[PDB]
Amino acid sequence: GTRRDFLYHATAATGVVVTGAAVWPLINQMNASADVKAMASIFVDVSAVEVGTQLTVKWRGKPVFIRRRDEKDIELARSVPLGALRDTSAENANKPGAEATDENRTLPAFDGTNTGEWLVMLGVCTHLGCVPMGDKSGDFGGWFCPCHGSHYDSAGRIRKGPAPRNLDIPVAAFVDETTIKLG
Amino acid sequence: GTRRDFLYHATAATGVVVTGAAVWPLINQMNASADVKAMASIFVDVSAVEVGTQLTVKWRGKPVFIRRRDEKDIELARSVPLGALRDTSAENANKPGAEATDENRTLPAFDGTNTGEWLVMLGVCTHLGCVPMGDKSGDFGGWFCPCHGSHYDSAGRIRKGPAPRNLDIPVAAFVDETTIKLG
Amino acid sequence: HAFSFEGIFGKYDQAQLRRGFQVYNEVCSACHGMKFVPIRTLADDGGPQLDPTFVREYAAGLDTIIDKDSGEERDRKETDMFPTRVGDGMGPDLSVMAKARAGFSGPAGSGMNQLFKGMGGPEYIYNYVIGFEENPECAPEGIDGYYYNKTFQIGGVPDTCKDAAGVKITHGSWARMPPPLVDDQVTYEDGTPATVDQMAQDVSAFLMWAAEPKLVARKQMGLVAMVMLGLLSVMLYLTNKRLWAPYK
Amino acid sequence: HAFSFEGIFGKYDQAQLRRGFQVYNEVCSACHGMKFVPIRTLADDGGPQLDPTFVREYAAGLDTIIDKDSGEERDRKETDMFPTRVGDGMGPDLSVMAKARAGFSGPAGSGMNQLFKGMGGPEYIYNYVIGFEENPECAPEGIDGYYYNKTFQIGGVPDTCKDAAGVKITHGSWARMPPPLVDDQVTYEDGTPATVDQMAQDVSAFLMWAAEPKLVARKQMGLVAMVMLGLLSVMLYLTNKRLWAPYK
Amino acid sequence: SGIPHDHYEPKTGIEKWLHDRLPIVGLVYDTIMIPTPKNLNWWWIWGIVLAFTLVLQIVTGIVLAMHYTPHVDLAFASVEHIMRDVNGGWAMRYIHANGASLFFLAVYIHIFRGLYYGSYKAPREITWIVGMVIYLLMMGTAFMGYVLPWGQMSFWGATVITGLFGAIPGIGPSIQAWLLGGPAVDNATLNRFFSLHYLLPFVIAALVAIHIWAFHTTGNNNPTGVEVRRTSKADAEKDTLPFWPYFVIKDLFALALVLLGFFAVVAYMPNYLGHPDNYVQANPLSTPAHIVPEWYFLPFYAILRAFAADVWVVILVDGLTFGIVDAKFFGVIAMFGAIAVMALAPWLDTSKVRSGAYRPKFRMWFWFLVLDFVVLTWVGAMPTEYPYDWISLIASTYWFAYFLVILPLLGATEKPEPIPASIEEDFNSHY
Amino acid sequence: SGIPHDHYEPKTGIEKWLHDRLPIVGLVYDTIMIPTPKNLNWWWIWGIVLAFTLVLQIVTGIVLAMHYTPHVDLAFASVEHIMRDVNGGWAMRYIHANGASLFFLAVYIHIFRGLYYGSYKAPREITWIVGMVIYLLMMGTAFMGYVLPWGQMSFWGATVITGLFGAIPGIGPSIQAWLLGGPAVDNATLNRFFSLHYLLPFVIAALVAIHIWAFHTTGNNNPTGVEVRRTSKADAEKDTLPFWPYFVIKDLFALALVLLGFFAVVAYMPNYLGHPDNYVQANPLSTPAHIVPEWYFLPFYAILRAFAADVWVVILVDGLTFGIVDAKFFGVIAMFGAIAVMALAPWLDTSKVRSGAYRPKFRMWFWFLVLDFVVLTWVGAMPTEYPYDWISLIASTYWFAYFLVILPLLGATEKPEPIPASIEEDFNSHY
Numbered sequence A, B: 001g002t003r004r005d006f007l008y009h010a011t012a013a014t015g016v017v018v019t020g021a022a023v024w025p026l027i028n029q030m031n032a033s034a035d036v037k038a039m040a041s042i043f044v045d046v047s048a049v050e051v052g053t054q055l056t057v058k059w060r061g062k063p064v065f066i067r068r069r070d071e072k073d074i075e076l077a078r079s080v081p082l083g084a085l086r087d088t089s090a091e092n093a094n095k096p097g098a099e100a101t102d103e104n105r106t107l108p109a110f111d112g113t114n115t116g117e118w119l120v121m122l123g124v125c126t127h128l129g130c131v132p133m134g135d136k137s138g139d140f141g142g143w144f145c146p147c148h149g150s151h152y153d154s155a156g157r158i159r160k161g162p163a164p165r166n167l168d169i170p171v172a173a174f175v176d177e178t179t180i181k182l183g
Numbered sequence C, D: 001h002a003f004s005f006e007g008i009f010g011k012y013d014q015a016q017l018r019r020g021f022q023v024y025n026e027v028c029s030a031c032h033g034m035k036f037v038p039i040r041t042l043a044d045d046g047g048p049q050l051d052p053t054f055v056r057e058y059a060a061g062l063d064t065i066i067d068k069d070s071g072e073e074r075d076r077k078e079t080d081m082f083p084t085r086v087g088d089g090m091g092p093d094l095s096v097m098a099k100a101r102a103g104f105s106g107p108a109g110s111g112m113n114q115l116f117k118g119m120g121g122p123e124y125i126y127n128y129v130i131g132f133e134e135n136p137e138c139a140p141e142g143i144d145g146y147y148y149n150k151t152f153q154i155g156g157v158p159d160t161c162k163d164a165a166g167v168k169i170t171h172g173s174w175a176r177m178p179p180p181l182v183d184d185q186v187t188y189e190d191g192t193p194a195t196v197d198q199m200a201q202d203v204s205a206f207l208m209w210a211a212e213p214k215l216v217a218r219k220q221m222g223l224v225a226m227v228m229l230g231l232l233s234v235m236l237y238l239t240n241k242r243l244w245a246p247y248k
Numbered sequence E, F: 001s002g003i004p005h006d007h008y009e010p011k012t013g014i015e016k017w018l019h020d021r022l023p024i025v026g027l028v029y030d031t032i033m034i035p036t037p038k039n040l041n042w043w044w045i046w047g048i049v050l051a052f053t054l055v056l057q058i059v060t061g062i063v064l065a066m067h068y069t070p071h072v073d074l075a076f077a078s079v080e081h082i083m084r085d086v087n088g089g090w091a092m093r094y095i096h097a098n099g100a101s102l103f104f105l106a107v108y109i110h111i112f113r114g115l116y117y118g119s120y121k122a123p124r125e126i127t128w129i130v131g132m133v134i135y136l137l138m139m140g141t142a143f144m145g146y147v148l149p150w151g152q153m154s155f156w157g158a159t160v161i162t163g164l165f166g167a168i169p170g171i172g173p174s175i176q177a178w179l180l181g182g183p184a185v186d187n188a189t190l191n192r193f194f195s196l197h198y199l200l201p202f203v204i205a206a207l208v209a210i211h212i213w214a215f216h217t218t219g220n221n222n223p224t225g226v227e228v229r230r231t232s233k234a235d236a237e238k239d240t241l242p243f244w245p246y247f248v249i250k251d252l253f254a255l256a257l258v259l260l261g262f263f264a265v266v267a268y269m270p271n272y273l274g275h276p277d278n279y280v281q282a283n284p285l286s287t288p289a290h291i292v293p294e295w296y297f298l299p300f301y302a303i304l305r306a307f308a309a310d311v312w313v314v315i316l317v318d319g320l321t322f323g324i325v326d327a328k329f330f331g332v333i334a335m336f337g338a339i340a341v342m343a344l345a346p347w348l349d350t351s352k353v354r355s356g357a358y359r360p361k362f363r364m365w366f367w368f369l370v371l372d373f374v375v376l377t378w379v380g381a382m383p384t385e386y387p388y389d390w391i392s393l394i395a396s397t398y399w400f401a402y403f404l405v406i407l408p409l410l411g412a413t414e415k416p417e418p419i420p421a422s423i424e425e426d427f428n429s430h431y
């Protein structure tokens, strides 16, 4: 009734809440422990990188890309209709709400010029996270991730393949002409 | 067919020799792999060791003992009846067949003098392989292994406890007065 | 004057962890490492709780590291460890020493009638610092180095003032560590008289936190296992009272 | 031309491993490491087989090591690895490269029609050394550094002699590694004409041994699994012939 | 029902006392015997070979753990030390690596034996479904195995396959850093992947308990697809024989042959299946040029990359959801679900012909699926150009339709053949 | 013969179809039910608590493996990182460490409940013996677990306990370097001891299968020591109740109490049992001053160091063998064999009284062996001085004689007490 059937189902509630919030800390351990919980900015001495190549760099586990965009790769990156992009967001943290124009895939050099010459995105492809072959490879004078065949232009925007977004531009910022702070 | 009788029991012989010398390499892996398969001599700069203490030293996994025997510890080690020892072998590799007299628990200095002043045995106690507390501890003006309570004199010979032999003297040899080669 | 954590539901003293932090940095860090303590934890909850950007500045001042990738130096970051001060003249890494030391012998040497009290560890630290003495029994011009400590049982005893029989016929023994707090050696913020006792009361509680930094968490955890398994227990008793009473 | 191991029951050439060993020490060791090869193995069975006390003397001459305990240097021992030559101008650690390279199709990336033959690796090495060329069609200056190799698929190409479309109009690609064997660069013991081909045939079989040093063992093992599981099989066929024939 | 055979009467005095306290004598007698249908061909060996290959894996699996060190800085070197210095340690590594191919080669032959002869269909549905979760575990296990020696194949597949769970919308990013132990594929990942590659093959051995349990309980199937006379006891005797010593010995024989094969493969081509860039120590900055998944994941590999966002059915669904099932997550769902429609196989055969060689219309779609499979594994090696993007799209779709259209058709749209009524009758048909 | 209960008739349509393919419904029904004697007191809870503690260990055991790195240079630091940085990783470490005490505390109460009430003695012999190998395994497992965080207690116990096998003459030095992986206790030891501390608790769960199997087959024992009316079916109903929901719920309750206990121990004194020199990173040159074995190994510790070569019986045997069973090897044999005479317990009770509180002569020797045990664990903490060498020699000899002299005597030299004939009758002597 409830004198010989209420304090039966009540106990198996406590025999579920106790063996529940004991089975949650078994899950939580597998999250990021404090040895990797945070990791803040780094400084990159560009200063002596040559022109028209990329410099790959590890930060927070996975690579960052810095290509100093040569002449072909700014013409053919500006020659790109905004409406002929999948992801039409800038993928930029510096310029948050912006759209994926070739002027939104860029860093200013002294702290204000901005010429199309600084391309800094990070080496995680948006499909399943591999790295793209650089120096004009594949089919859009850009970047070919050979993992499941995504293709990128010369602003890291997405063209062919399964990768649903462009390459993210991080929170990059200059300090002087020798140096870039990733933060 | 005609070759048939013990063929039943013949196959279960092959179904035992095949699943035998397949169950032997399962054993052999657990032996010493080639990262530890051998080990060779080292040089010890005694020179600046002070008098009447011990210097402990790692060689081939486990410690070696070098005590420079002070006055008390050569009187009271010579004052020892050979037949009042358990192990009455010298426990020496240098002097193989010798018996455990206080002149057989020693080494040269000027490659030939031998005064009772050089005591070099190794820190593996003979019971179950722990290390002995030094500087006259326990009960025989010597060495007390606090693992199962063995007692040693002042020549590393065995007195009280369960340890069935004396501490072994290795293949020690001098080169000049500053230096001892353990080989 | 009896620690704050210790008890049945006491916590770390917010004040005293900070107070005792400064004593490590000024006095003990030249001879002792914390190679198992990540520096970032100063700013953590349930500890001394500092400013994050201070912690960064503090960490900058600790010495360089042959960094594992570049293979060359840099100013130390806050993600990194305190340095391994174990070279020469240097003492043990006290990285987790305040649970590595428990010279507590009895009753009947098995751990028995410690029934109002505890286990012993932070209070061996307190006694190690205070107990630096004049060499009592015999011994002339020191032992050069080896300073007499009245608590340190396990080190040098001379046989001149050991025995003829066997044992040491003194209590403590001779360390290897200079008497590290000549009194008022640093200056406090929350008033607090900087005594040799008050600095050694204080640096004890800090070095406990470099052993159990998650301590005030287990005090919190305990109360909740007390409710949960308590009234699962109480509820399971009621389910045997009014279910077995058919056959009782 | 055709290696000794390769085949169905061939072994390592005793001579050729020794011959090729010297080429690593004199030519390649300045720019390449073997950090996964313990030096003591030169004297091992089924390899080049040297004198143990020579091996010791040889090992003495390889450079120092910040040894893990003392924290300071010594002359390298025979228990230790070859050194990590990976600094600057330096190439890949070839420590286990002759199974890390297999630039072979099928038609499949993972493989097909290799039915009289093998897997490919020691023969990429041979072709890497021989194929240092003059620059085909155009690319008529170098690239400063980056030397044209006709075999090295995976590297730099001046797009001048890549394409207007996609790939390379000129055969291999531009390395980063200087043409390392200007012919007769060292001197042999068992006669043997020290040609650029004969030195590159020879150092190939040695770097296979730094990938499968236990190789002549699996050849030995194979013969015994062939007997054992062979006449357990044959014996199990006879136990089905004259046991199932009641119902057959 | 239960095929009736003479069970265990504890006869001698030994066994009379044993049986009062632990009846293991009889449990092994009543399972080593068992009225097992007598017409069974060599496509039925592939379950002993599987079970063997699980013991072999389990066994070599532990040797390796006595030597391999699961931490990034040590990991590839430890494995590499196992090759050089551990006595017989190369023959352990090669045997446990090539084992997983054998383990997987034969699980396929196991599955296509079962697909022909109605072995998914009643009474056999629980036998089938339990094999699914064994499958699932076997793949996820051999995944985590591959991550361990931290070579480039190891590393990037870990970045890929954990990223697959990121494809899940909303909750999916969280599931990522949960399996990852954070931001990237660092060490916390390799430490947790040592753990679970050890645990899971024991769960797998407990599920072959419940698989051996099931196929005993249904009664063992036979290739006529007819059941095994559970009416009298002596007509069962004409239908069946005991496992031991007839079907034990057959399964032993073919195993000794399968093993005669397998030993030659380790001894004379042990890195054929292995993709040599795993001997290239893992670089978190360069994904290799020729990153191929290991062979036994290749046909499902291809299902994932059939469906780019040019494939109209994707565009549609990205269209109809208006943003969510893009060709990332679509291809995930595609591939995961390419398996789910193979689980679904007893519910979507509608025909009450059990078997195979008395079903000639089904018989030719099937050898199109065998083909389909081989072509799907093949086209995984091929790039995403024309014709390969089409070829893959054909293979993927044939697959996906065979379980969905062709199967719950063919019941309606086909009549049988000369199907027998006795297991003996087929067996007697030759002489 | 076996207690007659109403078994499983697959009643509803669900279960009718399930049962044709996998009968698990009924196997769980016929084991969650079971005619379990109704007079069972709280000394019978300690087998559920044991089984729980094994699940608890197995569970927290794997968490820890996702984090702990088994290699000497990383090992103590990894464990140390688990305390600090793994979310809740201190509460895992403390719970898996203190678990093994609980796991061992209660296995003792389990063993002395069984020692009183004739639970070794027929029909119950195989129930007992399987518990022996579960014991051996649990000990060796908890050994290898303690080696892992490479502290000084870890290190030296591994030098000691491997060295125990070196005490074997002739072949014994080989068996040493086999478990060692060479000369000393280096790293090859800690890599192999990671492996087998993972494997062995699975073998342990597979033997609690064959333990639960056995005590069902004998029928569950009761404190009268009389068997449970296997003649009619309705007199068994007066004798027994079903496990579920009567004896499931009792074993739940006491567990929730045992766990209420165990959680307070972790939360407020978690290094009490742990001997603090394990937080002293392992030095291969200094064996510590106060090296005590872990508490649950302490009374057998003492049996090894009772027998120094002053102990006359040793001198005798060193005498009689003329050199071979010196007090090294003797004390090994003494300690290993101190267990072997507890395995031997059903053959050396001669009395055909099964139980206990109807046996008043036996009942007071027993509380001497409880005391003996407590004194033996105690005197392991004590040095080898007078009186402790005598005390330990008294304890060790009492022990050894209880199973050898006192037990196959007392059959002859003692008559019973008022023993009942019904399980109900004792139970009603209360209603």
Ligand code: HEC
Binding pocket: C027, C028, C030, C031, C032, C089, C090, C091, C092, C094, C097, C101, C125, C128, C129, C152, C154, C155, C174, C175, C176, C177, C178, C180, C181, C203
């Ligand atoms: C260098 C001049 C030191 C100063 C400053 C501090 N310590 Fe130290 N300590 C030092 C040495 C060389 C040793 C060796 C061990 C011995 O034989 O005495 C120590 C020892 C300790 C110990 C305990 C070691 C033991 O064996 O129990 C402790 C707990 C300790 N030291 C603590 C400590 C504190 C709290 C300090 C700051 C006030 C401090 N030490 C300073 C060297 C030096």
Ligand code: HEC
Binding pocket: D027, D028, D029, D030, D031, D032, D089, D090, D091, D092, D094, D097, D101, D125, D128, D129, D152, D154, D155, D174, D175, D176, D177, D178, D180, D181, D203
């Ligand atoms: C310094 C002048 C070197 C000499 C001497 C040798 N190698 Fe080398 N090598 C060097 C560099 C900087 C590289 C970089 C990779 C590239 O972009 O070309 C290499 C490369 C190799 C490789 C393969 C690398 C790859 O990407 O496939 C191999 C197999 C190789 N080198 C072999 C090799 C041999 C056999 C040598 C002795 C005759 C030798 N190298 C010498 C630098 C230098």
Ligand code: HEM
Binding pocket: E043, E044, E045, E046, E047, E048, E050, E051, E052, E054, E107, E110, E111, E114, E119, E120, E124, E127, E128, E130, E131, E132, E134, E135, E138, E208, E211, E215, E218, E219, E220, E221, E222
């Ligand atoms: C990988 C571990 C496996 C083992 C160890 C194993 C073992 C066995 C054995 C001994 C049999 C009996 C006959 C035979 O050998 O063909 C069998 C049959 C069967 N298995 Fe598996 N098998 C495994 C995998 C699978 C998988 C992965 C599936 C499903 C996708 C599956 C589904 C079946 C079916 C449906 C049968 C036939 C039932 C019958 O003949 O009554 N099995 N297996």
Ligand code: HEM
Binding pocket: E054, E057, E058, E060, E061, E062, E064, E065, E068, E079, E093, E096, E097, E100, E103, E138, E141, E142, E143, E144, E145, E146, E147, E148, E149, E197, E198, E199, E201, E202, E204
């Ligand atoms: C279902 C059973 C198993 C499967 C399918 C399997 C699969 C694999 C695979 C594919 C690898 C990679 C081999 C390589 O690339 O070198 C591997 C490695 C490894 N597995 Fe297993 N395995 C199984 C059982 C086990 C078990 C039970 C263990 C538990 C100890 C284990 C421990 C290891 C270890 C230590 C390695 C590293 C050795 C190496 O990479 O060569 N395996 N496994």
Ligand code: HEM
Binding pocket: F043, F044, F045, F046, F047, F048, F050, F051, F052, F054, F107, F110, F111, F114, F119, F120, F124, F127, F128, F130, F131, F132, F134, F135, F138, F208, F211, F215, F218, F219, F220, F221, F222
């Ligand atoms: C450590 C794992 C063990 C588990 C998980 C376990 C579990 C159980 C359970 C559930 C029972 C039934 C009644 C009870 O709880 O008292 C039982 C009884 C028993 N156990 Fe164990 N037990 C274990 C250890 C042992 C050991 C170590 C021994 C022998 C030295 C042993 C010998 C027995 C005996 C003789 C019985 C009584 C049989 C009966 O009541 O018919 N058990 N155990």
Ligand code: HEM
Binding pocket: F054, F057, F058, F059, F060, F061, F062, F063, F064, F065, F068, F079, F093, F096, F097, F100, F103, F138, F141, F142, F143, F144, F145, F146, F147, F148, F149, F197, F198, F199, F201, F202, F204
């Ligand atoms: C019969 C079950 C078990 C027993 C008696 C047992 C016992 C122990 C003990 C006493 C320790 C030392 C704890 C310490 O000093 O910190 C330990 C450590 C450890 N055990 Fe187990 N354990 C069991 C189950 C398992 C299993 C199944 C695993 C398999 C993954 C495992 C993995 C570990 C690990 C990684 C450690 C090191 C963590 C640490 O030392 O704190 N345990 N175990």
Ligand SMILES: C/C=C(C)/C=C/C=C/[C@H](OC)[C@@H](C)[C@@H](OC)[C@@H](C)CCc1oc2c(O)c(OC)cc(OC)c2c(=O)c1C
Binding pocket: A147, A148, E136, E137, E139, E140, E143, E153, E154, E156, E157, E160, E161, E162, E179, E291, E292, E293, E294, E297, E300, E301, E304, E335, E336
């Ligand atoms: C933490 C991890 C856990 C809990 C396990 C997760 C398991 C997911 C699945 O397990 C059931 C998974 C194994 C299974 O998916 C159905 C496979 C067939 C995955 C197929 C697979 O393989 C690849 C591979 O091997 C690579 O190597 C060089 C590289 C790869 O990229 C290029 C892939 C890849 O793109 C895919 C889809």
Ligand code: FES
Binding pocket: A125, A126, A127, A128, A129, A130, A145, A146, A147, A148, A149, A150, A161, A162, A163
């Ligand atoms: S992951 Fe970038 S291509 Fe598939």
Ligand code: FES
Binding pocket: B125, B126, B127, B128, B129, B130, B145, B146, B147, B148, B149, B150, B161, B162, B163
């Ligand atoms: S080990 Fe030396 S006394 Fe037991």
